[PDB]
Design a protein around this motif. Structure first.
Motif, mmCIF file in Angstrom:
data_model
loop_
_atom_site.group_PDB
_atom_site.id
_atom_site.type_symbol
_atom_site.label_atom_id
_atom_site.label_comp_id
_atom_site.label_asym_id
_atom_site.label_seq_id
_atom_site.Cartn_x
_atom_site.Cartn_y
_atom_site.Cartn_z
ATOM 1 N N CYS A 28 0.817 -1.208 0.000
ATOM 2 C CA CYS A 28 0.000 0.000 0.000
ATOM 3 C C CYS A 28 0.850 1.257 0.000
ATOM 4 O O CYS A 28 0.500 2.226 -0.652
ATOM 5 N N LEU A 29 1.967 1.236 0.726
ATOM 6 C CA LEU A 29 2.896 2.353 0.693
ATOM 7 C C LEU A 29 3.440 2.601 -0.713
ATOM 8 O O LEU A 29 3.431 3.729 -1.204
ATOM 9 N N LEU A 30 3.890 1.540 -1.375
ATOM 10 C CA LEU A 30 4.405 1.697 -2.738
ATOM 11 C C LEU A 30 3.320 2.214 -3.678
ATOM 12 O O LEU A 30 3.588 3.060 -4.526
ATOM 13 N N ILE A 31 2.108 1.694 -3.533
ATOM 14 C CA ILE A 31 0.993 2.071 -4.408
ATOM 15 C C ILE A 31 0.613 3.527 -4.213
ATOM 16 O O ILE A 31 0.404 4.252 -5.189
ATOM 17 N N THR A 45 -0.149 -9.009 -3.292
ATOM 18 C CA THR A 45 0.895 -9.300 -2.308
ATOM 19 C C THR A 45 2.132 -8.467 -2.605
ATOM 20 O O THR A 45 2.705 -7.876 -1.705
ATOM 21 N N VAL A 46 2.544 -8.422 -3.866
ATOM 22 C CA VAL A 46 3.609 -7.507 -4.255
ATOM 23 C C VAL A 46 3.172 -6.611 -5.386
ATOM 24 O O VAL A 46 2.515 -7.054 -6.331
ATOM 25 N N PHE A 47 3.556 -5.348 -5.284
ATOM 26 C CA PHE A 47 3.239 -4.354 -6.287
ATOM 27 C C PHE A 47 3.870 -4.734 -7.621
ATOM 28 O O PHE A 47 4.928 -5.374 -7.665
ATOM 29 N N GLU A 48 3.197 -4.369 -8.709
ATOM 30 C CA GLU A 48 3.732 -4.553 -10.051
ATOM 31 C C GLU A 48 5.133 -3.940 -10.148
ATOM 32 O O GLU A 48 5.476 -2.998 -9.413
ATOM 33 N N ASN A 49 5.937 -4.465 -11.062
ATOM 34 C CA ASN A 49 7.223 -3.862 -11.351
ATOM 35 C C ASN A 49 6.979 -2.403 -11.695
ATOM 36 O O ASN A 49 6.014 -2.075 -12.389
ATOM 37 N N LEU A 165 11.249 7.614 9.767
ATOM 38 C CA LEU A 165 10.082 8.409 9.381
ATOM 39 C C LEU A 165 8.838 7.589 9.608
ATOM 40 O O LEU A 165 8.874 6.362 9.535
ATOM 41 N N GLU A 166 7.733 8.282 9.833
ATOM 42 C CA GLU A 166 6.436 7.637 9.997
ATOM 43 C C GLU A 166 5.555 8.093 8.877
ATOM 44 O O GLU A 166 5.679 9.231 8.389
ATOM 45 N N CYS A 167 4.661 7.223 8.461
ATOM 46 C CA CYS A 167 3.732 7.584 7.396
ATOM 47 C C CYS A 167 2.415 6.846 7.542
ATOM 48 O O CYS A 167 2.301 5.889 8.297
ATOM 49 N N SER A 168 1.430 7.309 6.784
ATOM 50 C CA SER A 168 0.180 6.588 6.619
ATOM 51 C C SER A 168 -0.155 6.529 5.138
ATOM 52 O O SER A 168 -0.460 7.542 4.537
ATOM 53 N N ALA A 169 -0.092 5.343 4.546
ATOM 54 C CA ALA A 169 -0.553 5.168 3.185
ATOM 55 C C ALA A 169 -2.020 5.570 3.075
ATOM 56 O O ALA A 169 -2.446 6.148 2.070
ATOM 57 N N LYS A 170 -2.794 5.267 4.115
ATOM 58 C CA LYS A 170 -4.243 5.505 4.084
ATOM 59 C C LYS A 170 -4.579 6.988 3.972
ATOM 60 O O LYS A 170 -5.411 7.367 3.159
ATOM 61 N N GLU A 177 7.606 12.042 1.893
ATOM 62 C CA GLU A 177 8.831 12.241 2.651
ATOM 63 C C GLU A 177 9.636 10.950 2.826
ATOM 64 O O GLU A 177 10.862 10.978 2.854
ATOM 65 N N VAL A 178 8.945 9.828 2.960
ATOM 66 C CA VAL A 178 9.638 8.554 3.027
ATOM 67 C C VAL A 178 10.513 8.323 1.818
ATOM 68 O O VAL A 178 11.688 7.945 1.931
#
Ligand SMILES: Nc1nc2c(ncn2[C@@H]2O[C@H](COP(=O)(O)OP(=O)(O)NP(=O)(O)O)[C@@H](O)[C@H]2O)c(=O)[nH]1
Ligand SMILES: [Mg+2]
Length: 188
Positions: A28-31, A45-49, A165-170, A177-178
């Motif tokens: 979700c972070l990558l997306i 489960t894993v993001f597309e290349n 660093l802290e983040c929220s994908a949501k 920043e990440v």
């Protein structure tokens, strides 16, 4: 080893690998970083290349985003992803103090073995859950509480991370920043 509460008082091409416990929010972070949209239904489960374009400190960077599966079941094949890594995002979830304990127990030994001397960004995901009522209640029954920022920072110090660093994908909080930090680490 379960977490105990209250113990802490021209384009440049770079390869990023993201690791961390199952369900701690890596994909979700990558997306959200790549697509600017939180996947509220289906999540692979894993993001597309994917190669992301990012400008940091006046430098144009292409960031290849290598997603990995967090579950122990994938331990044998995950190291296939590590060669020539420029920066590691090492994640835990703020709603799972046990996922933080797996940072020094599992992820740091794994990453330092396969990616010696590659900078690590320690990332606390799901920041939106820090004060969440359901999260607090669920963790409270286990005598735990959401990860405190000082606990994340202490862990980043302990593992000699490049940064914390802290983040929220949501909510998107802190996501850009990440990746900017990871890019800075990969550049130097
Ligand atoms: N509240 C909240 N939930 C989140 C956040 N990011 C991800 N999640 C949720 O956490 C769950 C797992 O997310 P996911 O990104 O698939 O985790 P993962 O680390 O990639 N898992 P795996 O290691 O098995 O591939 C999903 O139900 C997703 O909706 C966030 O920032 N906040
Ligand atoms: Mg995933």
């Amino acid at each position: 080893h379960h977490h105990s509460s209250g113990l802490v008082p021209a384009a440049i091409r770079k390869k990023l690998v993201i690791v961390g416990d199952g369900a701690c929010g890596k994909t979700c972070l990558l997306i959200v970083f790549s697509k600017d949209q939180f996947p509220e239904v289906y999540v692979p489960t894993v993001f597309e290349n994917y190669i992301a374009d990012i400008e940091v400190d006046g430098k144009q960077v292409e960031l290849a985003l290598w997603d990995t599966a967090g579950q122990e079941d994938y331990d044998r094949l995950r190291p296939l992803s590590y060669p020539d890594t420029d920066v590691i995002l090492m994640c835990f979830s703020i709603d799972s103090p046990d996922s933080l304990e797996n940072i020094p127990e599992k992820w740091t030994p794994e990453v330092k073995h396969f990616c010696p001397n590659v900078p690590i960004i320690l990332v606390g995901n799901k920041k939106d859950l820090r004060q969440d009522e359901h999260t607090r209640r669920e963790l409270a029954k286990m005598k735990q509480e959401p990860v405190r920022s000082e606990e994340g920072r202490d862990m980043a110090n302990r593992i000699s991370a490049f940064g914390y660093l802290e983040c929220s994908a949501k909510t998107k909080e802190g996501v850009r920043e990440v990746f900017e930090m990871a890019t800075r680490a990969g550049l130097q």
